[PDB]
Amino acid sequence: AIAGFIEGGWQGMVDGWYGYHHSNEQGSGYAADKESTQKAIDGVTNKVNSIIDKMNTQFEAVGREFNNLERRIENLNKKMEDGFLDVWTYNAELLVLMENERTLDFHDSNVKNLYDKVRLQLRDNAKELGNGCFEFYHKCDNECMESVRNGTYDYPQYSEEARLKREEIS
Amino acid sequence: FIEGGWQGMVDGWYGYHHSNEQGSGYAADKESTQKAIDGVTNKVNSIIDKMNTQFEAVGREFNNLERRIENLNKKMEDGFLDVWTYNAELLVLMENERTLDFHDSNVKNLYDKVRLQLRDNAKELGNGCFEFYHKCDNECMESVRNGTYDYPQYSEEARLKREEIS
Amino acid sequence: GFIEGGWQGMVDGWYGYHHSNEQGSGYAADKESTQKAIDGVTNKVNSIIDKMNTQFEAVGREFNNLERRIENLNKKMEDGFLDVWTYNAELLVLMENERTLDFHDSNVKNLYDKVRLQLRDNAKELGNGCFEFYHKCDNECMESVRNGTYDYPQYSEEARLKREEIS
Amino acid sequence: GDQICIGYHANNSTEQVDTIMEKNVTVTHAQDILEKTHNGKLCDLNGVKPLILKDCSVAGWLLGNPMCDEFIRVPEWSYIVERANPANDLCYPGSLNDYEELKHMLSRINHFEKIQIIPKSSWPNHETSLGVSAACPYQGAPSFFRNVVWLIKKNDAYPTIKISYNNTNREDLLILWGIHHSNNAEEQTNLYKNPITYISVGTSTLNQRLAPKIATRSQVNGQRGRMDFFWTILKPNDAIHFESNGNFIAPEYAYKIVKKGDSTIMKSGVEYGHCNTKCQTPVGAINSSMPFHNIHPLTIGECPKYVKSNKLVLATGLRNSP
Amino acid sequence: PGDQICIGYHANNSTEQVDTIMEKNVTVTHAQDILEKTHNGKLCDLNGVKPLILKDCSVAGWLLGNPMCDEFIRVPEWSYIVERANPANDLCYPGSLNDYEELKHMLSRINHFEKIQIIPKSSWPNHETSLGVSAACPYQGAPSFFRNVVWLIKKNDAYPTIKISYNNTNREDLLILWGIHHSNNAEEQTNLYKNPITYISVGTSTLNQRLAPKIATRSQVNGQRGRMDFFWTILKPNDAIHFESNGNFIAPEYAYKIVKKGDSTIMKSGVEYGHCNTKCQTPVGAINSSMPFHNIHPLTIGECPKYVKSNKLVLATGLRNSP
Amino acid sequence: GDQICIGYHANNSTEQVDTIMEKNVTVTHAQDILEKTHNGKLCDLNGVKPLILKDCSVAGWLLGNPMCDEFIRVPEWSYIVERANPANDLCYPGSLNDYEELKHMLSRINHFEKIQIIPKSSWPNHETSLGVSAACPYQGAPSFFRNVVWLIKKNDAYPTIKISYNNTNREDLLILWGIHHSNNAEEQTNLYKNPITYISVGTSTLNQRLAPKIATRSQVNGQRGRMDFFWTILKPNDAIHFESNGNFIAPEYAYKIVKKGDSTIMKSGVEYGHCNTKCQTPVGAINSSMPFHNIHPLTIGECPKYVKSNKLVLATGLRNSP
């Protein structure tokens, strides 16, 4: 999705994280779907917190308190301190790597979901170009464009109107 | 676009709802629900059965002139407390995400499984339901849930409702 | 899902295509999709290996029979770390194995749909992961589907000569 | 036209679980993997009853504190249950050398039996009946520990003691003995007649010399004198050799002892309840297959991993919608 | 020439890179590091309690009253002790302190600490209390001795057997220190204590100690071949301590009222106190953070994140940036 | 009709992996990340040979046990290999003070060199030849520890010993001495001529005073007597001072010792194999980059994390369908 049908990424879309781009005979502008975004930032913020806020911290005093005739006991403490370091280091590294993917696949899914919703709203009164953009037949007004972005698509309007543009010049 | 979740389905997890001339009813797909129930029970069994438990004897055997060794054991005890607490809480959070999306994927694959048989014989309503372009009995309804839909037997009747209705 | 079975005959990659036109029948192997998968699982395997911090540690039993309390303290630590490492490793393999397998499923489907969005209406899906080209096709036309250079306008009107004409 | 739909199952369900990106998500079915329940009793550990010292410490029980109850023989036990502050530990003020290491070894014992090794008939030239104190009373009369004998001079003489004992049993022997520290030179002469005394204890591995530390001390249990007790494990066919000329607390009884496994000592006030468990805590026992619990950190047995949490709820069903 | 509706995501000018389980060096729009690497560089109070900062003195030199180690205690309560790696003023007269390390552990966090004189110098009328002075413990260039104990010497060529007692009429535990002087030969024994064979007896409800001097040949440390071994005990309220000796007795003069509720450790650090507060202290600086991990120092004192061997733990929060 | 297809790989592989939701899933390619193989030999640790005592314990090798082979000069080692129960520990019964700490310090040594610090010629008034016992035979004849001298009275005289040694070397010196405990008063005077004796050892740190413990003990290796050995690290330019009038086991050799890193003592019977490794186990060496292993818990070096598993198989290939 993210590097699939859509290949790049819009620097002009500063309103949100996911959104649209319309290009008709009266304009060419960007827009966002504040619904699909706000779940991502809220969820992403939740993920970052859930990782931080679930750590239990307790008061501990760490020092070197064994003399030269207690090296075995100090070695016992070294194995413990080192052992806990490797446990926390390995878990932290893999947690970030595994969760960093999940954020990227999370952003993958929401974009594909927005694309899939439009694909069924328009059925075959538009064309799948493979770049994510949809090639309209029926000619779409900004009101008609809005009916796609925020779902208000009164499909009865262009049901027959598409027929008068869809298969005509063929 | 598959919104809600039917309360009338009290047999399985994933299923169908048909509405034809004979009536409207609910039905379940036994395989997808099973494949799911074999799976999550494996997931919960794996989380439980993969834990290695050994016999241990935890006490306080050091006197008042061995408080440094007592502090050593304490740091060891709270160290494993933090490790096990942190891993446990995150594991439930991560697998609960995995479990939920597992149900989401199953319902989507079942949605496509119907589509791959209907093809152009039926519409897509954009809400999880398909509008048939022909007349469908409960026999044909069971032909769709089973996975034995006959595309040729309703191809022409599809066009009678498709192009004639202007 | 769509692609049920699995081709032995393909040996040049991980995902591939099959063509059965009248000029010949044979298999093929993708490169861009398969290679991106080779790096992903090789890095995923390497991420699990290379991220492990290893230090010099000398493990022994150097407490006598009058230090059994301290010796038991060592045993509790050694068993505690074993329980942590055994549990974390076993679940790490189980969790990543399920996603590695599903990674293959996603990659294969994202090639089936790539054909689907390139074919438009010139062919009928077979339901088994195949597209019955009811129009005319060529061996050179076969790679244009795989190359991503398939051109509907070549058989554009020819599609209507087979779509609405064949009733 | 005719319609066919795809959907999922919903029910009545107020159960909520948490995900990494969402909070308080209602589900159809859910399962907790965190153990939170215990029976509130102390139980047998894998079939073997514990050794429950009610108001006695291990030191008092081994030496035979008269104020403690008499030996109700328990040949084997899986762990020791002790009170936080046992009432009767050492009726005569003193100490027991290597107490914690001794307690750790006695935590789990397969076979335990008290045998007389040196009867009171073996001290013809010393008085074996005047070694009593008000700090160790029995039936209102002055007494002493019931497994060791406080030897006193007879006819104003303390001839040198030279007695050996050979462990002819097939099992290890737990042997205990002590030394008495006087308060002044006068007290030393009234009891042992010898101004300067010593104790020698020799085995195949033990080579010990003791001297009484006669000095001024505070009054404990009405006594300013002290008695330090020492112990050892006599392996089979080995011998222990005692030599002394005063201040010697000789053994009468010893303990045949066999050790197979290890355990610890549990401090608890809960009562024994005639049941079995694989996992015991000072507040109760755990019967669970769950990998985590939050009941108590001081567990004994094969137990779940102690964690600091209230609920580890995994999602098994779907996302419920009312 | 038809109309188009497109689907896409947000991109920006971010250089932030994150690594995933399958890809490395992936630029993202937004990111957050959960690793903590910042410390204020100062010694701070732990939960409102000022640490006991011994400047150039060790705990043993501070307790016994090393003449070069500052009196007056100042802090009646401290959260942790800051010693230097190799304190200069440990024990001017060579010897040892029994159970020093457990004693250091107990004094790491003290709720109340007050020095009260228990045995004044006037309580030794038959002995010499002013000649127990060595060049090993100098003060203002002049030879001196430990402040909190008194080195008793014979007077008029006689050392009467000392028998003294102290009842601890306070409501708090008392830390008492005493010592034994090991001579170098039998003549030093007579020239200092007049009794060829000597002993020390200390008794409480729980303490039964008898020591004898060990006359032997040792090396010179701080120009001294003799040694002095010091001992300590905690005298519970209403419990009494009894001293008996006839030579080589380093008698106590001052003791310490001590109350201990919590426990801590001793930190080795040279960096300067900075009039601050913190919940986590390290020898190089204090940590104010909520992050779950850090890599500042392993020898932490307080409520701290988990120490790791890592330079970066960057979580990807935003989208996949593409230029 | 001509059609195109989408598909994947399927080889002959029977390799099986497990997923969190499914068990025994056959795959085309997969990789195991659990190390299970070892070469079965003891190796060098980062190009340093271990010090391997064949039949000897650390104490016997240090003190010069006659049955233990002569001191093969080992300038350095990374760890020490002992057997489970070394045959030649201490031929004369006794003990070595702080033995376990001494063993721990000696586990890894950067430079080790034996030197003579008090030669036998330095005892004109004491007998350096009859300190020999049947408990330590050499070639079927009575002998004694080689690196210490058992001084006996000469001409019915044991003059008080006063010897001091200054560490003029640039490295730390490990010095061992001992005291012999007599069995009775007649034996004490038959060897030392003085009934009441002592030993005084002094350095900048050490302040030691010992006396013999003449008493009755069990017969070990044919001897009812005992020898207690001690040790200290003499810092450079420091001097040790000895004084005794009997029962003195004087040193002849010390040990120039330089310690940089630390290790432990490995108990193994495996044979050395002229190899090199980063990780060593008592059953063999591990040459690996894998993160987990299940070979042996007692490892030395940089090793994978020990776990309880027989497989850790990561699926790298696709689902192989036959």
Ligand SMILES: *[C@@H]1O[C@H](CO)[C@@H](O[C@@H]2O[C@H](CO)[C@@H](O[C@@H]3O[C@H](CO)[C@@H](O)[C@H](O)[C@@H]3O)[C@H](O)[C@H]2NC(C)=O)[C@H](O)[C@H]1NC(C)=O
């Ligand atoms: C404690 O008493 C036991 C039994 O009285 C002593 O064990 C006995 O020790 C002697 C050696 O001194 C053993 O003699 C051996 O007998 C075998 C034949 O059985 C013979 O072939 C050998 O050459 C040797 O003479 C004797 O068997 C053994 N008796 C047993 C084990 O029942 C033990 O020595 C005494 N310990 C002390 C410290 O006094």
Ligand SMILES: *[C@@H]1O[C@H](CO)[C@@H](O[C@@H]2O[C@H](CO)[C@@H](O[C@@H]3O[C@H](CO)[C@@H](O)[C@H](O)[C@@H]3O)[C@H](O)[C@H]2NC(C)=O)[C@H](O)[C@H]1NC(C)=O
């Ligand atoms: C063991 O023998 C060594 C070597 O003889 C002794 O070390 C020496 O100690 C003296 C005095 O402590 C040092 O003298 C000083 O030398 C400096 C010049 O470096 C000079 O400026 C001073 O005024 C003073 O004369 C001498 O340098 C030193 N030799 C060394 C370190 O090689 C050591 O004292 C002896 N130890 C015992 C316990 O006998």
Ligand SMILES: *[C@@H]1O[C@H](CO)[C@@H](O[C@@H]2O[C@H](CO)[C@@H](O)[C@H](O)[C@H]2NC(C)=O)[C@H](O)[C@H]1NC(C)=O
């Ligand atoms: C220290 O002095 C106190 C003085 O109070 C002694 O305690 C008293 O002991 C007598 C006799 O046992 C009792 O009648 C008093 O009631 C005690 N005082 C209180 C306040 O209860 C204490 O025994 C002395 N400690 C010694 C001598 O070791």
